Short mmCIF file of C-alpha atoms in Angstrom, two decimals:
data_model
loop_
_atom_site.label_atom_id
_atom_site.label_comp_id
_atom_site.label_asym_id
_atom_site.label_seq_id
_atom_site.Cartn_x
_atom_site.Cartn_y
_atom_site.Cartn_z
CA UNK A 1 -54.55 -64.16 -152.93
CA UNK A 2 -53.99 -61.78 -156.09
CA UNK A 3 -57.34 -61.08 -158.11
CA UNK A 4 -58.61 -57.90 -161.26
CA UNK A 5 -58.01 -55.85 -158.75
CA UNK A 6 -54.86 -55.90 -157.37
CA UNK A 7 -52.63 -53.84 -159.05
CA UNK A 8 -50.17 -55.21 -162.23
CA UNK A 9 -47.16 -54.37 -161.37
CA UNK A 10 -47.52 -56.78 -158.36
CA UNK A 11 -49.01 -59.88 -159.88
CA UNK A 12 -45.89 -59.76 -162.22
CA UNK A 13 -44.05 -59.62 -159.35
CA UNK A 14 -45.30 -62.96 -158.19
CA UNK A 15 -45.65 -64.40 -161.51
CA UNK A 16 -41.70 -63.57 -161.76
CA UNK A 17 -41.32 -65.29 -158.26
CA UNK A 18 -39.10 -68.84 -157.82
CA UNK A 19 -41.33 -71.60 -157.81
CA UNK A 20 -44.69 -69.32 -158.81
CA UNK A 21 -45.40 -72.00 -161.53
CA UNK A 22 -45.33 -70.22 -164.07
CA UNK A 23 -43.81 -72.62 -167.50
CA UNK A 24 -41.07 -71.11 -168.85
CA UNK A 25 -36.89 -72.71 -170.74
CA UNK A 26 -33.72 -71.45 -171.63
CA UNK A 27 -34.24 -71.87 -175.53
CA UNK A 28 -36.19 -69.93 -178.13
CA UNK A 29 -36.89 -70.92 -181.87
CA UNK A 30 -37.03 -68.27 -184.82
CA UNK A 31 -38.13 -68.10 -187.74
CA UNK A 32 -36.23 -65.88 -190.22
CA UNK A 33 -37.25 -65.10 -193.79
CA UNK A 34 -34.67 -65.84 -196.28
CA UNK A 35 -35.15 -67.12 -199.84
CA UNK A 36 -34.13 -69.43 -200.89
CA UNK A 37 -32.20 -71.63 -197.58
CA UNK A 38 -32.40 -75.28 -196.96
CA UNK A 39 -31.49 -77.52 -193.94
CA UNK A 40 -28.38 -79.69 -193.41
CA UNK A 41 -30.19 -82.47 -193.34
CA UNK A 42 -31.46 -82.42 -196.29
CA UNK A 43 -28.34 -81.70 -198.63
CA UNK A 44 -27.07 -84.85 -196.88
CA UNK A 45 -30.53 -87.06 -197.75
CA UNK A 46 -29.94 -85.44 -201.71
CA UNK A 47 -26.13 -86.23 -202.44
CA UNK A 48 -26.93 -89.83 -200.63
CA UNK A 49 -30.34 -90.89 -202.70
CA UNK A 50 -28.53 -88.65 -206.15
CA UNK A 51 -25.08 -89.15 -206.58
CA UNK A 52 -22.67 -92.92 -207.30
CA UNK A 53 -19.82 -93.88 -205.15
CA UNK A 54 -20.74 -93.54 -201.31
CA UNK A 55 -21.36 -96.78 -199.31
CA UNK A 56 -22.57 -95.61 -196.29
CA UNK A 57 -24.41 -91.94 -195.77
CA UNK A 58 -21.53 -91.10 -193.01
CA UNK A 59 -19.79 -90.43 -196.49
CA UNK A 60 -22.31 -88.35 -197.84
CA UNK A 61 -22.02 -85.85 -194.96
CA UNK A 62 -18.32 -85.26 -195.29
CA UNK A 63 -18.97 -84.27 -198.94
CA UNK A 64 -21.69 -82.12 -197.62
CA UNK A 65 -18.59 -80.74 -195.37
CA UNK A 66 -16.50 -80.26 -198.43
CA UNK A 67 -19.31 -78.43 -200.18
CA UNK A 68 -19.18 -75.69 -196.94
CA UNK A 69 -15.24 -75.94 -196.81
CA UNK A 70 -15.00 -74.96 -201.03
CA UNK A 71 -17.64 -71.43 -200.14
CA UNK A 72 -19.91 -73.74 -203.19
CA UNK A 73 -22.92 -73.42 -199.50
CA UNK A 74 -22.71 -71.38 -196.79
CA UNK A 75 -23.53 -70.86 -193.20
CA UNK A 76 -26.31 -68.71 -192.75
CA UNK A 77 -25.04 -67.32 -189.34
CA UNK A 78 -21.66 -67.37 -187.75
CA UNK A 79 -19.80 -70.22 -187.70
CA UNK A 80 -17.56 -72.68 -188.62
CA UNK A 81 -17.99 -76.37 -188.24
CA UNK A 82 -21.25 -77.67 -190.80
CA UNK A 83 -23.99 -79.79 -188.58
CA UNK A 84 -27.21 -80.76 -190.09
CA UNK A 85 -30.21 -78.81 -188.06
CA UNK A 86 -28.32 -75.75 -189.25
CA UNK A 87 -29.17 -73.99 -192.52
CA UNK A 88 -27.61 -73.19 -195.30
CA UNK A 89 -28.35 -70.81 -198.69
CA UNK A 90 -26.32 -71.30 -201.90
CA UNK A 91 -23.17 -69.75 -202.56
CA UNK A 92 -21.62 -67.76 -205.78
CA UNK A 93 -22.30 -70.21 -209.01
CA UNK A 94 -20.75 -67.73 -211.31
CA UNK B 1 -27.32 -92.64 -212.41
CA UNK B 2 -25.21 -89.05 -214.37
CA UNK B 3 -23.81 -87.57 -211.15
CA UNK B 4 -21.02 -89.24 -209.48
CA UNK B 5 -18.22 -88.81 -206.33
CA UNK B 6 -15.77 -88.54 -209.17
CA UNK B 7 -18.09 -85.76 -211.26
CA UNK B 8 -16.47 -81.39 -210.11
CA UNK B 9 -17.92 -80.04 -207.24
CA UNK B 10 -19.27 -76.86 -208.42
CA UNK B 11 -21.43 -79.44 -211.49
CA UNK B 12 -22.77 -81.11 -208.73
CA UNK B 13 -24.08 -77.85 -206.49
CA UNK B 14 -25.42 -76.49 -209.74
CA UNK B 15 -27.61 -79.89 -210.52
CA UNK B 16 -28.55 -79.36 -206.51
CA UNK B 17 -29.38 -76.04 -207.36
CA UNK B 18 -31.33 -75.98 -209.97
CA UNK B 19 -35.61 -75.79 -210.30
CA UNK B 20 -37.04 -78.84 -209.95
CA UNK B 21 -33.69 -80.83 -208.90
CA UNK B 22 -35.76 -82.21 -205.49
CA UNK B 23 -33.49 -80.46 -202.84
CA UNK B 24 -35.86 -79.46 -200.36
CA UNK B 25 -35.49 -74.67 -200.74
CA UNK B 26 -37.28 -72.24 -199.26
CA UNK B 27 -37.86 -69.47 -198.04
CA UNK B 28 -36.85 -69.29 -194.09
CA UNK B 29 -34.79 -70.06 -191.71
CA UNK B 30 -35.06 -72.13 -187.71
CA UNK B 31 -32.64 -70.99 -185.57
CA UNK B 32 -32.65 -71.49 -181.13
CA UNK B 33 -31.29 -69.16 -178.89
CA UNK B 34 -30.00 -69.11 -175.35
CA UNK B 35 -32.57 -67.49 -173.55
CA UNK B 36 -32.46 -67.77 -169.90
CA UNK B 37 -35.84 -67.79 -168.45
CA UNK B 38 -37.67 -66.90 -171.87
CA UNK B 39 -41.51 -68.03 -172.18
CA UNK B 40 -44.75 -68.25 -173.96
CA UNK B 41 -47.76 -66.47 -174.28
CA UNK B 42 -50.02 -68.62 -174.11
CA UNK B 43 -48.06 -69.74 -170.68
CA UNK B 44 -48.57 -66.61 -168.98
CA UNK B 45 -52.06 -66.60 -170.17
CA UNK B 46 -52.45 -70.40 -168.67
CA UNK B 47 -50.63 -68.44 -165.37
CA UNK B 48 -53.06 -65.31 -164.79
CA UNK B 49 -56.53 -67.76 -165.54
CA UNK B 50 -55.19 -69.97 -162.67
CA UNK B 51 -53.74 -67.88 -160.42
CA UNK B 52 -55.49 -64.40 -160.93
CA UNK B 53 -58.90 -64.22 -159.72
CA UNK B 54 -61.46 -62.40 -161.46
CA UNK B 55 -61.18 -64.47 -165.23
CA UNK B 56 -65.02 -64.68 -166.67
CA UNK B 57 -63.69 -66.13 -169.11
CA UNK B 58 -60.05 -66.89 -170.78
CA UNK B 59 -59.91 -64.08 -173.10
CA UNK B 60 -59.87 -61.80 -170.61
CA UNK B 61 -56.65 -63.66 -169.74
CA UNK B 62 -55.42 -62.62 -172.72
CA UNK B 63 -56.52 -59.30 -172.70
CA UNK B 64 -54.52 -58.50 -169.21
CA UNK B 65 -51.34 -60.19 -171.02
CA UNK B 66 -51.84 -58.00 -173.67
CA UNK B 67 -51.96 -55.24 -170.83
CA UNK B 68 -48.68 -56.02 -169.22
CA UNK B 69 -47.20 -56.60 -172.89
CA UNK B 70 -48.51 -52.55 -173.19
CA UNK B 71 -46.85 -51.58 -169.82
CA UNK B 72 -43.47 -52.44 -170.71
CA UNK B 73 -44.06 -55.39 -167.35
CA UNK B 74 -42.99 -58.39 -169.47
CA UNK B 75 -41.31 -57.30 -173.46
CA UNK B 76 -41.08 -59.28 -176.85
CA UNK B 77 -37.98 -61.34 -177.41
CA UNK B 78 -38.06 -59.52 -181.15
CA UNK B 79 -39.14 -56.04 -182.39
CA UNK B 80 -42.64 -57.02 -182.29
CA UNK B 81 -45.40 -54.64 -181.09
CA UNK B 82 -49.13 -56.67 -181.59
CA UNK B 83 -49.16 -59.27 -177.92
CA UNK B 84 -49.94 -62.95 -179.33
CA UNK B 85 -49.59 -66.42 -177.79
CA UNK B 86 -47.43 -67.73 -179.94
CA UNK B 87 -43.54 -65.69 -179.45
CA UNK B 88 -41.55 -65.21 -176.68
CA UNK B 89 -41.75 -63.20 -173.99
CA UNK B 90 -38.90 -62.09 -171.53
CA UNK B 91 -39.84 -60.15 -168.59
CA UNK B 92 -40.02 -56.30 -168.08
CA UNK B 93 -37.51 -53.81 -165.03
CA UNK B 94 -38.99 -55.16 -162.04
CA UNK B 95 -36.96 -53.06 -160.21
CA UNK C 1 -52.20 -66.30 -208.13
CA UNK C 2 -54.16 -69.42 -208.41
CA UNK C 3 -55.95 -70.32 -205.38
CA UNK C 4 -58.71 -68.02 -203.43
CA UNK C 5 -60.96 -67.72 -201.26
CA UNK C 6 -63.35 -69.42 -203.57
CA UNK C 7 -61.24 -72.49 -204.14
CA UNK C 8 -62.82 -75.31 -203.12
CA UNK C 9 -61.83 -76.61 -199.85
CA UNK C 10 -61.05 -80.21 -200.64
CA UNK C 11 -59.15 -78.77 -203.73
CA UNK C 12 -57.05 -76.38 -201.23
CA UNK C 13 -56.18 -79.10 -198.87
CA UNK C 14 -54.48 -81.96 -201.71
CA UNK C 15 -52.02 -78.78 -202.96
CA UNK C 16 -51.18 -77.76 -199.15
CA UNK C 17 -50.69 -82.27 -199.65
CA UNK C 18 -48.67 -82.16 -202.74
CA UNK C 19 -44.88 -82.66 -202.57
CA UNK C 20 -43.04 -79.50 -203.29
CA UNK C 21 -46.10 -77.59 -202.34
CA UNK C 22 -44.08 -75.64 -200.05
CA UNK C 23 -45.43 -76.52 -196.41
CA UNK C 24 -42.88 -78.07 -194.24
CA UNK C 25 -43.64 -81.51 -193.61
CA UNK C 26 -41.20 -84.03 -190.81
CA UNK C 27 -42.00 -87.23 -189.45
CA UNK C 28 -42.04 -85.95 -185.73
CA UNK C 29 -44.37 -84.43 -182.95
CA UNK C 30 -43.45 -82.66 -179.58
CA UNK C 31 -46.07 -83.88 -177.22
CA UNK C 32 -46.43 -81.84 -173.84
CA UNK C 33 -47.11 -84.53 -170.08
CA UNK C 34 -48.51 -82.83 -167.40
CA UNK C 35 -46.21 -85.31 -164.63
CA UNK C 36 -46.33 -83.59 -161.24
CA UNK C 37 -42.50 -84.29 -159.84
CA UNK C 38 -40.06 -85.03 -163.05
CA UNK C 39 -37.57 -84.86 -163.59
CA UNK C 40 -34.47 -84.87 -166.31
CA UNK C 41 -31.32 -87.59 -165.95
CA UNK C 42 -28.79 -84.91 -166.75
CA UNK C 43 -31.16 -83.26 -163.21
CA UNK C 44 -30.52 -86.75 -161.36
CA UNK C 45 -26.37 -86.76 -162.67
CA UNK C 46 -25.58 -82.97 -161.72
CA UNK C 47 -27.24 -83.95 -157.95
CA UNK C 48 -25.58 -86.87 -157.56
CA UNK C 49 -21.85 -84.88 -158.57
CA UNK C 50 -22.35 -82.31 -156.40
CA UNK C 51 -23.98 -83.74 -153.25
CA UNK C 52 -22.76 -87.44 -153.33
CA UNK C 53 -18.95 -87.64 -151.98
CA UNK C 54 -15.89 -90.82 -153.46
CA UNK C 55 -16.67 -89.68 -156.89
CA UNK C 56 -13.41 -89.02 -158.76
CA UNK C 57 -15.05 -87.51 -162.54
CA UNK C 58 -19.07 -86.83 -163.47
CA UNK C 59 -18.78 -89.88 -165.48
CA UNK C 60 -18.97 -92.33 -162.42
CA UNK C 61 -21.48 -90.33 -160.97
CA UNK C 62 -23.99 -90.90 -164.67
CA UNK C 63 -22.50 -94.54 -163.65
CA UNK C 64 -24.36 -95.15 -160.45
CA UNK C 65 -27.61 -93.50 -162.04
CA UNK C 66 -27.99 -96.21 -164.21
CA UNK C 67 -27.46 -98.51 -161.27
CA UNK C 68 -30.90 -96.33 -159.85
CA UNK C 69 -32.18 -96.87 -162.67
CA UNK C 70 -31.69 -100.64 -162.99
CA UNK C 71 -32.82 -101.10 -158.84
CA UNK C 72 -35.81 -99.97 -160.14
CA UNK C 73 -35.37 -96.78 -157.30
CA UNK C 74 -35.62 -94.55 -160.38
CA UNK C 75 -38.37 -95.42 -163.24
CA UNK C 76 -38.10 -93.93 -166.99
CA UNK C 77 -41.48 -92.54 -168.67
CA UNK C 78 -41.73 -94.44 -171.68
CA UNK C 79 -40.92 -98.15 -172.01
CA UNK C 80 -36.59 -97.74 -172.40
CA UNK C 81 -33.63 -99.66 -170.80
CA UNK C 82 -30.90 -97.85 -171.09
CA UNK C 83 -29.99 -95.01 -169.16
CA UNK C 84 -30.39 -91.40 -171.02
CA UNK C 85 -29.81 -87.97 -169.70
CA UNK C 86 -31.80 -86.54 -172.04
CA UNK C 87 -35.04 -88.63 -171.14
CA UNK C 88 -37.02 -87.99 -168.01
CA UNK C 89 -37.80 -89.98 -165.37
CA UNK C 90 -40.01 -90.29 -162.41
CA UNK C 91 -38.89 -91.71 -158.21
CA UNK C 92 -39.71 -95.66 -157.96
CA UNK C 93 -41.31 -97.26 -154.96
CA UNK C 94 -39.73 -96.07 -151.60
CA UNK D 1 -21.55 -83.35 -146.01
CA UNK D 2 -23.18 -86.90 -145.03
CA UNK D 3 -23.60 -88.67 -147.94
CA UNK D 4 -21.00 -91.06 -150.01
CA UNK D 5 -20.23 -93.72 -152.45
CA UNK D 6 -20.41 -96.30 -149.16
CA UNK D 7 -23.73 -94.49 -147.86
CA UNK D 8 -26.72 -97.59 -149.22
CA UNK D 9 -28.54 -96.87 -152.47
CA UNK D 10 -32.36 -96.61 -151.50
CA UNK D 11 -31.03 -94.09 -148.72
CA UNK D 12 -29.25 -91.37 -151.05
CA UNK D 13 -32.53 -91.84 -153.58
CA UNK D 14 -34.93 -90.91 -150.85
CA UNK D 15 -32.26 -87.65 -149.58
CA UNK D 16 -32.22 -87.11 -153.05
CA UNK D 17 -36.52 -87.38 -153.45
CA UNK D 18 -37.56 -85.07 -149.75
CA UNK D 19 -38.31 -81.75 -149.94
CA UNK D 20 -35.49 -78.87 -150.61
CA UNK D 21 -32.98 -81.38 -151.96
CA UNK D 22 -31.60 -79.09 -154.30
CA UNK D 23 -32.98 -81.43 -157.07
CA UNK D 24 -34.68 -79.91 -160.27
CA UNK D 25 -37.73 -81.33 -161.24
CA UNK D 26 -40.43 -80.13 -163.63
CA UNK D 27 -44.27 -80.45 -163.42
CA UNK D 28 -44.04 -80.89 -167.28
CA UNK D 29 -42.01 -83.75 -170.00
CA UNK D 30 -41.89 -83.46 -173.89
CA UNK D 31 -41.71 -86.80 -175.59
CA UNK D 32 -41.21 -86.85 -179.03
CA UNK D 33 -43.14 -89.85 -181.42
CA UNK D 34 -42.66 -90.47 -184.64
CA UNK D 35 -45.03 -90.05 -187.13
CA UNK D 36 -45.07 -89.77 -190.61
CA UNK D 37 -45.74 -86.23 -192.13
CA UNK D 38 -47.13 -84.26 -189.08
CA UNK D 39 -46.95 -80.57 -189.29
CA UNK D 40 -47.69 -77.80 -186.71
CA UNK D 41 -50.83 -75.72 -186.64
CA UNK D 42 -49.06 -72.48 -187.15
CA UNK D 43 -46.93 -73.90 -190.46
CA UNK D 44 -50.27 -74.64 -192.00
CA UNK D 45 -51.59 -70.78 -191.16
CA UNK D 46 -48.23 -69.62 -192.84
CA UNK D 47 -49.15 -71.20 -195.92
CA UNK D 48 -52.88 -71.12 -196.11
CA UNK D 49 -52.01 -67.20 -195.53
CA UNK D 50 -49.34 -67.06 -198.28
CA UNK D 51 -50.78 -69.27 -201.50
CA UNK D 52 -54.45 -68.68 -200.90
CA UNK D 53 -55.49 -64.83 -202.05
CA UNK D 54 -58.37 -63.04 -200.77
CA UNK D 55 -57.47 -63.02 -196.37
CA UNK D 56 -57.72 -59.54 -195.52
CA UNK D 57 -55.53 -60.49 -192.47
CA UNK D 58 -53.52 -63.40 -191.00
CA UNK D 59 -56.38 -63.85 -188.38
CA UNK D 60 -59.10 -65.30 -191.67
CA UNK D 61 -56.29 -67.40 -192.22
CA UNK D 62 -56.20 -69.12 -188.92
CA UNK D 63 -60.61 -69.58 -189.49
CA UNK D 64 -60.29 -71.45 -192.24
CA UNK D 65 -57.14 -73.61 -190.94
CA UNK D 66 -60.23 -74.42 -188.20
CA UNK D 67 -62.13 -74.73 -190.92
CA UNK D 68 -59.93 -77.54 -192.03
CA UNK D 69 -59.90 -79.50 -188.69
CA UNK D 70 -63.77 -79.74 -188.95
CA UNK D 71 -64.63 -81.04 -192.16
CA UNK D 72 -62.25 -84.18 -191.38
CA UNK D 73 -59.51 -82.21 -194.04
CA UNK D 74 -56.91 -81.87 -190.89
CA UNK D 75 -56.91 -84.29 -188.17
CA UNK D 76 -55.63 -83.98 -184.71
CA UNK D 77 -52.57 -86.88 -183.62
CA UNK D 78 -54.36 -86.64 -179.97
CA UNK D 79 -57.87 -86.41 -178.58
CA UNK D 80 -58.04 -82.52 -179.16
CA UNK D 81 -61.73 -80.68 -180.19
CA UNK D 82 -60.21 -77.57 -180.73
CA UNK D 83 -57.15 -75.80 -183.48
CA UNK D 84 -54.64 -74.98 -181.68
CA UNK D 85 -51.55 -73.93 -183.69
CA UNK D 86 -49.10 -74.98 -181.20
CA UNK D 87 -50.31 -78.41 -181.59
CA UNK D 88 -49.24 -81.17 -184.58
CA UNK D 89 -51.71 -82.69 -187.69
CA UNK D 90 -51.89 -85.10 -190.24
CA UNK D 91 -54.25 -85.74 -193.08
CA UNK D 92 -57.10 -86.46 -193.05
CA UNK D 93 -58.71 -89.28 -196.00
CA UNK D 94 -58.10 -87.46 -199.63
CA UNK D 95 -59.08 -89.83 -202.17
#
């Protein structure tokens, strides 16, 4: 039904139709170059392994959330709540 | 040994930020965007090779996909010109 | 810069494999499998809630779906017992 | 409309399983496997291009990555022969 002889716009319209078989998703992943960034779970891990006084990892997560509230670490996107799957940078440490 | 829950917060943070602290710190971040009906360039190429007659090899279906981008029939999700199988695309104006 | 196309390949790889090399390493991988007519647990829960009368709220549609898995009317694709909306399923022997 | 909590369960399932039932189906699924220290082919190519001098463009860094897979210095996690940026690898025997 379709070939290299078919006009391009018609081929694309067929590809864009319901049930065409094109594999699609409602999410995408993008890589941004940001100097000196770090993953929320990596902060929590570092705290739990290098800072004494956390009985369970849950308490390290809570400290990292405190760090964000104080502006010692900062969100890279417009977000308020602490999250382990988000990326962060250091605050003003002057 | 040396840092505890009793240490000043700024000083902990500055320990974590020093060179050689062990914190995984790198020049990148990954972000999840919700974009309904987006698609990888490799899946366009696969669809074309499987549904459009006359591609002697897969590389010819890749070149045709690049032609779709050039024409505006598909569009990059970010500001980039060259076609790549690893990037995400959406459909252009099909009205 | 200390590495180039003149460096032996084995040494370049041991550099990439070193701690703190820069290379993103994580303890996971995602595998894509072709399985005609598979579906997410959430897609089952949605269909029951929209098409079967008498559920007071969505949670009871979730419990019904878990009942379908117990009965073998739907099946996990991997060896697992607990029903989850995020997992993939196929139909049982009907 | 026709189906309720009083309907036998097998019949509800057969209705859900019929063509045009409205059930969202797919023919691809994604499985997560816990593999220690695995990495994407794309991150290999990014690392090489960023840290190894003498690549005129990124495609030469990819060709180099492919060199590494042939030599067994890196290894596919599933039985695939050719190098792909979208697949996951682990290191080979490094002593």
